[PDB]
Design a protein around this ligand. Structure first.
Ligand SMILES: CCOC(=O)c1ccc(OCCCCC2CCN(c3ccc(C)nn3)CC2)cc1
Ligand SMILES: *C(=O)CCCCCCCCCCCCC
Ligand SMILES: *C(=O)CCCCCCCCCCCCC
Lengths: 62, 59, 279, 266, 4, 266, 62, 4
């Protein structure tokens, strides 16, 4: 059940990809740590809720 | 955003001076840095982008 | 293998090749080996530079601060119910000197905290075991005015809760510099005086200093409400640089440090008396 | 082949050419030639200015005289060049500026003169001050421009507390910074030993914790020239020969244009 | 294992 | 397609951007865009300086006011830009300099105002003088810098012989130069007619009998702005609206670097 | 995710290559121990910064 | 494993 992922290495030792291992010990997922591997998304639903979304080089009002 | 009447017209200079010199007191000095000349008209709003110009990677 | 080069067997010479002569004016160190100037035997070399690698040189937890905090009846005059320390390697001299063989560095930092305590007075009853809160306050964040005010709520600042008697506390910090490397030396100013300034204090700055708060502070307190009897505690902070890289070598500090910059004051006489022709 | 040599060099940059018939080879600091900021090391997003030949050429500073009592001279970069033609204008019109340098130090004498100049290029050459007050040297004093500063044989603490001088007090055997001068050789350097060579030539890369920085707020390189062996001639007890420093910016680029910076050097 |  | 128009333009050069919502298209003088000197038209052999974004950007001159009595304004190039940032520094540090220009003239009012500005870009705009004395206008008077000069409705001969003014006397219907103004339209031009457009935009190529010349000794282009139809509003007999001129150097290159030229404008 | 390397054995017991095992428990590489497997380099950028690097048996100045 |  071990889960293996690559670390995003910031300061590299003078010694390439480094990994870390995770194992869940409990049946209830609420007990689990946070994966912190979070996908992002477009702001458009907030920055552009327009029915006709227009392109920035064209006149906003036409 | 210009919230004046439609019969009102005008041209405005909006600017950005990167650090290190005297903060602008005259249009003459402001012209010399990053700037947009905004013409008021049917498109009511103007956008000036302040480009990331820094020495450090994070301020 | 990481052993050093073997010594080559070298015999007599009568030639136009002269390794022994050179000109240091060029800026260069003469690349000579024993076999360039004396007859040598073959030696299979097994020695290595494993312990003098940059990581191995700094791979040791060094004492950078002694923070003192009291736990006692909150009276009404300047007390030590909580304490603050600006994070630095400059309050101590030993690690400071080691880091300063180099102009720039880049590394992750490991902090270990040894906490000791004792009874301040002859006797008023005793004290139940104490829990300590070590809170990091990054620049910009509200600093505490009182040992139990809202800032200790620590919702976003990282805090360590240490139980007295437990194994010394330990955390790791990423490389957190605003630049691509840490500057151990900065020949400059944070501000420039301009000809058009009102007072000439507007543009005044400390030589060599960069940001006002550098990296923030560690605020320390005893979470326990006070016992009747006073308990005094000291938190010793040990710092170790790990996953280390360094650039541009420098001469080591030869005279005693005098504050956070390169300033010297006295004991400017590092070298002993020895006669020119005395072994 | 043909007749070439380690001692005879011609350096050409822009409309300027230097010849030398008595060089001791030349140094490239840390093995790195000057270069422009690469896209994958770039931080300011605005299109840079690269003035090329108009700034990357040889500027000759005011000559200093070397005599039997001369304890040494120092300069900072870009500061020594702040008033140098179009380089200076570009430095003061932009918030950001990076540049490498070719440093050519000149000092000839005669086969009967004697003495040796230690020429050192130091990254981040922080100097020590005047006072009980730490890190208190003023900007105007820290930056002598083309004039440079000097070294002293000993530490005279600026005593006048009430109206302080806020100057550096660079002691020679301590390299003006709390270390021993004999170890300054770990820094990029050459020696002008008068029986061997007329000059020193050091090529400096931009060195910093950042790809580009404020040239007005921060000096990148310090140039320290100290007499390792004192000037001597015949029996004349008061000899004097000129030292001339010529410096060229290389691969100069500037970001963050706006109105001109006018620092207060009073 | 489940190596991602 | 999408919604584009002849009246709405964005001009971007260096760190500067101009927007306009009421343009009357834009003119490229003689159908030629600015360009650099080609190798087969090259004359000075020294490697040129091309300052690019630091000089080829929009400089806005001091605003002039247009009122019912305003007879007209004139400017010369490169002169109007001699003190403009790094362009000015490059102009005065080199013997030779060539450059093209984007000229943007700005004048808005209201749908109830009236009037028409004739905006003319003239190659070699030689102006007429003060006196009985021919070709006697002084350099300092010929070159007003950013201020520009004005036109007059009539010829007032500078009479004071003994201590002469040595100024131009540009009469408006004679285009300040002995010809009739109505024919000035053979020169590259636009009209700012207030019911139609806020502005004029003229792109100027370098024009000369040579590929490159002295910018300090010689102006290439003259900018003449004359009211073809007088400013009028409602019934208010003393109306006044601002005219603002913004100019950008383009494809600027300089040869013959040395110490800075400091002309005497007293 | 276990990582296995050879130890450089100093004093050998009277009993060949011996190994040690490493596993990273944390997502942030800053949390990791030091590998101490550090590669070295030439001193030349310091001991010989010369534009024309010359060979030791030839005259330094020519 | 990742045995080096
Ligand atoms: C002022 C001169 O010294 C330096 O330049 C210099 C450079 C780098 C240094 O590294 C420290 C930077 C990180 C600062 C802190 C970041 C977080 N820290 C924490 C955080 C949370 C806890 C609970 N305990 N410690 C402790 C350290 C320290 C000093
Ligand atoms: C998947 O996990 C198979 C590999 C298991 C390796 C040994 C795990 C040892 C830890 C056991 C966890 C027990 C938790 C209740
Ligand atoms: C790679 O690691 C796969 C093999 C895992 C062997 C069992 C590991 C037991 C330790 C689990 C570490 C959990 C750390 C959060």
């Amino acid at each position: 059940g071990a889960q293996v992922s690559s670390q995003k290495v910031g300061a590299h030792e003078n010694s390439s990809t480094i990994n870390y291992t995770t194992i869940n010990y409990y049946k209830d997922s609420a007990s689990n740590a946070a994966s912190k591997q979070d996908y992002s998304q477009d702001p458009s639903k907030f920055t552009e809720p327009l029915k006709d979304v227009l392109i920035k080089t064209a006149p906003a009002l036409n | 955003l210009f919230c004046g009447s439609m019969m009102a017209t005008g041209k405005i200079l909006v600017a950005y001076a990167p650090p290190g010199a005297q903060p602008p007191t005259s249009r003459k000095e402001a012209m010399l840095g990053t700037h947009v000349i905004w013409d008021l008209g049917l498109q009511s709003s103007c956008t000036m982008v302040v480009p990331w110009i820094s020495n450090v990677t994070y301020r | 293998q990481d052993s050093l080069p073997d010594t080559k067997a070298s015999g007599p010479a009568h030639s136009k090749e002269v390794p022994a002569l050179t000109a240091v004016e060029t800026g260069a160190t003469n690349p000579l080996a024993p076999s360039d100037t004396v007859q040598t035997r073959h030696v299979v070399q097994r020695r290595s530079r494993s312990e003098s690698t940059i990581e191995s040189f700094f791979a040791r937890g060094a004492c950078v601060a002694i923070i003192e905090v009291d736990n006692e009846q909150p009276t009404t005059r300047a007390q030590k119910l909580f304490a603050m320390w600006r994070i630095t390697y400059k309050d101590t001299v030993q690690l400071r000197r080691k880091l300063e063989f180099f102009t720039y560095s880049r590394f992750d930092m490991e902090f270990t905290f040894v906490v000791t305590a004792n009874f301040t007075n002859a006797n008023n009853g005793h004290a139940l075991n104490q829990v300590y809160q070590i809170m990091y306050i990054p620049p910009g964040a509200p600093t505490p005015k009182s040992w139990d005010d809202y800032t200790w709520q620590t919702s976003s600042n990282p805090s360590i809760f240490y139980t007295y008697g437990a194994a010394p506390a330990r955390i790791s910090v990423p490389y957190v510099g605003l630049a691509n490397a840490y500057s151990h030396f900065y020949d400059g100013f944070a501000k420039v005086p301009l000809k058009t300034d009102a007072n000439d204090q507007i543009g005044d700055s400390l030589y060599s200093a960069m940001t006002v708060d550098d990296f923030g502070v560690l605020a320390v307190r005893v979470v326990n409400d006070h016992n009747p009897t006073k308990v005094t505690s000291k938190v010793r902070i040990y710092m170790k640089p790990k996953h280390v890289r360094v650039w541009c070598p420098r001469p080591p500090r030869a005279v005693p440090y005098y504050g956070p910059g390169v300033d010297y004051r006295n004991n400017l006489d590092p070298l002993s008396e020895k006669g020119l022709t005395t072994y | 082949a043909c007749g070439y040599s380690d001692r005879v060099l011609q350096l050409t940059l822009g409309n300027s050419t230097i010849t030398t018939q008595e060089a001791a080879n030349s140094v490239v600091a840390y093995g790195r030639w000057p270069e422009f900021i690469r896209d994958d090391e770039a931080n300011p997003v605005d299109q840079p200015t690269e003035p090329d030949v108009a700034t990357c050429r040889f500027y000759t500073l005011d000559t200093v005289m070397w005599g039997k009592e001369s304890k040494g001279w120092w300069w900072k970069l870009p500061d020594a060049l702040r008033d140098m033609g179009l380089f200076g204008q570009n430095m003061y019109y932009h918030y950001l500026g990076r540049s490498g340098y070719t440093v050519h130090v000149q000092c000839n004498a005669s086969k009967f003169h004697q003495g040796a100049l230690g020429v050192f290029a130091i990254p981040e050459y922080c100097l020590a001050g005047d006072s009980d007050k730490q890190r208190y040297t003023s900007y105007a004093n820290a930056n002598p421009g083309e004039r440079g500063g000097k070294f002293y044989s000993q530490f005279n603490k600026d005593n006048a507390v009430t109206s302080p001088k806020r100057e550096f007090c660079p002691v020679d055997y301590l390299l003006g910074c709390g270390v021993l001068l004999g170890n300054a050789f770990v820094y990029p350097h050459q020696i002008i030993n008068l029986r061997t060579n007329n000059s020193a030539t050091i090529v400096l890369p931009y060195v910093n914790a950042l790809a580009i920085d404020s040239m007005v707020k921060h000096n990148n390189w310090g140039i320290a020239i100290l007499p390792l062996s004192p000037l001597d001639f015949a029996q004349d007890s008061s000899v004097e020969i000129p030292i001339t420093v010529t410096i060229a910016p290389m691969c100069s680029e500037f970001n963050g244009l706006r109105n001109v910076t006018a620092p207060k050097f009073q | 294992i489940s190596e991602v």
